[PDB]
A paper describes a structure:
In this study, we report the discovery and characterization of a new psychrophilic laccase, a multicopper oxidase (MCO), from the bacterium Oenococcus oeni. Laccases (benzenediol:oxygen oxidoreductase, p-diphenol oxidase EC 1.10.3.2) are blue multicopper oxidases (MCO), copper-containing enzymes that catalyse the oxidation of a substrate reducing molecular oxygen to water. The structure of LcOe 229 showed the three specific structural features observed in the LAB laccases.
We obtained two types of crystals for LcOe 229, one for the enzyme without Histag and the other for the enzyme with Histag, that were grown under two different conditions and which diffracted X-rays to 3 and 3.5 Å, respectively, each one having a different monoclinic space group. Crystals were grown in a condition containing 18% PEG 10000, 20% glycerol, 100 mM Tris-HCl pH 8.5, and 100 mM NaCl. For LcOe 229, the Ramachandran plot showed 93.7% residues in favoured regions, 6.21% in allowed regions, and 0.21% of outliers. The asymmetric unit of each crystal contained two molecules, which exploited two packing interfaces; however, according to the PISA server, both interfaces were the result of crystal packing. Interestingly, in both crystals of LcOe 229, we just could trace the C-terminal end until residue C477, which was forming a disulphide bond with residue C151 of Domain 1. There was no electron density for the last eleven residues, an indication of disorder and flexibility. The structure of LcOe 229 showed the T1Cu site with a Cu2+ ion coordinated by two His (H451 and H392), one Cys (C446), and one Met (M456).
Author numbering:
A (entry chain A): 1 to 477
B (entry chain B): 2 to 477
Amino acid sequence: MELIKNYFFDEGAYDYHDGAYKHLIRPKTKMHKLIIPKVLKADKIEGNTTYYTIHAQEGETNILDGKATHTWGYNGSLLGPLIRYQSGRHYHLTLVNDLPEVTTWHWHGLNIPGPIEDGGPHAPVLPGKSREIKFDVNQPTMTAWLHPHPCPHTAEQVWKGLAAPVAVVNPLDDLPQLPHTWGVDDIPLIFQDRTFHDSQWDYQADYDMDGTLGDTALVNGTVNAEFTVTRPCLRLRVLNGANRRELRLNSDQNIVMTQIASDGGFLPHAIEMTKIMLTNAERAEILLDFSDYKKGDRIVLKADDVPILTLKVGEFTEDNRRQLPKTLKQIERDFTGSPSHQVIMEGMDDSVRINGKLYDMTRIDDRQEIGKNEIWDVSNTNDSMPGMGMIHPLHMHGTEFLVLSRNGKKPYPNEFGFKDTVAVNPGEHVKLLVKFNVPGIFMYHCHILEHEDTGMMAQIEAVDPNNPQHWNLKDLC
Amino acid sequence: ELIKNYFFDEGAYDYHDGAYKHLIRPKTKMHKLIIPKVLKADKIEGNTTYYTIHAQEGETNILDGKATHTWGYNGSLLGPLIRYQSGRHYHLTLVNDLPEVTTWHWHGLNIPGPIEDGGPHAPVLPGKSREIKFDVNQPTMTAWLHPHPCPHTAEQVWKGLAAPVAVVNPLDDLPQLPHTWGVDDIPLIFQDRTFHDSQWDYQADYDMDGTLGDTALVNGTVNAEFTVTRPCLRLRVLNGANRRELRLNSDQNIVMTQIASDGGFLPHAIEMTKIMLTNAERAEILLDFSDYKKGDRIVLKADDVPILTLKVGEFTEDNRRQLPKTLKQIERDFTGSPSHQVIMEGMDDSVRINGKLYDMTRIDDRQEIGKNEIWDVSNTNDSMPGMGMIHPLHMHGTEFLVLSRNGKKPYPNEFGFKDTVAVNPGEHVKLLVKFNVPGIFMYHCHILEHEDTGMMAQIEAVDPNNPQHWNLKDLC
Ligand SMILES: [Cu+2]
Ligand SMILES: [Cu+2]
Ligand SMILES: [Cu+2]
Ligand SMILES: [Cu+2]
Ligand SMILES: [Cu+2]
Ligand SMILES: [Cu+2]
Ligand SMILES: [Cu+2]
Ligand SMILES: [Cu+2]
């Protein structure tokens, strides 16, 4: 009835129309057990402050069933742990670079001061050296993530294995009816694509200016992953951590995915679907129900046609199903009037640009006063004809916005919540309601990592009127 | 608005008795509060879950000297948290490793009587063991396990046998509550004993009107201290005394929000700074430590003696979640004559039900399962002060509603389901009772020395579509 059974974005511009597209290959290895990221432990709690330490470091990981792979990871050989943050708490972080080149810690999703706490290009930690930052957190319940933002080297470092999941909990809008037992009924899905060259990742080998694609899907750094379900309800926190690849998530048994959340948090109401497309950097939290299944059944989840995660059903321990409310979260959406900001995304490959300009680190491209609600007009000037086009996902640092309209029409069924990343189809005009809460220099860019690297970034000053600020910007790219 | 008084009639409180024993705050180090381990499942196959529980002997360091000789379930003393879920089948194995006969009464669980009931008819001999099956179909609530032989229940409870039982129903559970067992969700199993050379001797302390100890335990811990690491704390309080009433207070009159009673949640939450509990009663309360500083102690006391100290540490999370105004929907509209009468009478030796002592081979009442019948439990002890005692009526295999007390509305926290109810002298408490499973169930005074003496009786919960012949024997 009201069940989606399709993929929302315009198909004529999907990634697989590209001339140098790489199809995924289901690799020949044993079914590995799905790796769950460990929960990051606190060094200490002192007042409302919580002390964390995170090392960027090199290591070997047995991913295939042969040699190991040379990986980069946070507090480990590859990927990183679950980092919990709580709304209304102060956090002290220690960023230790144990890698042999400069990196940053961009907290994609966290609304914290820019451009240092933010973790964008401006804040660099040198090999050997480390960095300290403080910040308060004040935002809704949502799933975020951590990745490197060094310029122009992000893509390479993400490819090298740097990324981590970030859970943010707000006591005043959290839904404790949902599965929350991390590792058991509440799981991340960090989808990425890589190509192994003798059980080894070589970014230089696979590079494409329009975005680098791998031929082998990973999931939490696991290949041919299998997760055993021991409870009826499963909460998946899906994240497209690819450089370029779109994630068209489906199943052969068309199991209903009820989506409770997006990049910015819970949605007004739940949305039932059997498919879901995710562009880069976009998260979705979905519930699955295994009640009407028998023990031993496999529910294979596929990206397009290739299997990436298998959900095997065991004997259930308890029944973790709890009736939800109809409204998951209250959200004002009544906003009108002309756009005060315009972002024309244009080009492909070499040509990629924003408002005709490439990233310059010493330039402020826009300004907006914190607190106010201003409307944006993000557009894509790619050819609409099928295969002519391309889907760029706009990301904005230090904020969560609302999608107001797409070419005048209502946004897709699952976009009535807060987001920080949004797919723009060719020829489209997406209207966004943006509000900055903390001031500072923030980024906005295409989250296809090879585009950002090649200069699809721009900077905005979130202005506090009661604290005009002088900036000493340098370019380190 | 805020209740600040104990509910029951004071003229009949335990401390009017001629041979009352005052509690003594003992001189020992502040011990860390013991949290019962969660019982592991042997296996799961289908909707069935397999448990095994040993009754067994052991030594426990309770004081800071010698150890004490204790009895316990899967351990030296007390027992673990036993989780049950509504809408599941359970297979249990009861292994008696004690040197005398015991049972496994699941006080609170609505399961068939009188075998799976764990009542007197279900003895397990020393060395031998027993198997039982049963489905669970009841609301979210806290129950407990204790032995119920004839007439040795009191001695065996005193010896250390008891355990907390959590029962969860997915369709009426409130996941807003603290549920992280051991962290923000803990039991409070209040008991009183007297140590004779760091040793329990029931024969020494015995009083037919109920045995009293001079030393409060809490989860078998003396001078317990629990460190709070989260703003909201869920206490599951249980009076596991033989006789002693539990007048729970605090010197700093912290507000206790009472979410639940013996049969589970209340229609709405009730705020109070005090709460009285008679034997076998349970109450789940929330405390809020937001407006406190680190290092503060919130001492809970039974009467004038401290039993637990809640030290405030650095908080890890904020676990406070808005509750709804109605915690649970409950029909209370029920009228018409009582079809059942229980006259509780006597004290000490005289104690009796409807003029009769417990006889194990006799059916004292009958009631058809499914139907809602009204009961009239009364106390004919003198109303005049110091001349009366409060007997708590318990009924096996059912959860009832308190409809009225001497015609008046029941106390502020009695609008939910209970299985135990205090009856003041001269009182007439009207109860709405329904049996869901048939069999031979007990109803009795849960002052354990009264039950042993015989303040007990038996009812046949009759299934009309399965009349049964009973071969009842006295296993006393
Ligand atoms: Cu990002
Ligand atoms: Cu970002
Ligand atoms: Cu792009
Ligand atoms: Cu960025
Ligand atoms: Cu009992
Ligand atoms: Cu009972
Ligand atoms: Cu009595
Ligand atoms: Cu009983």
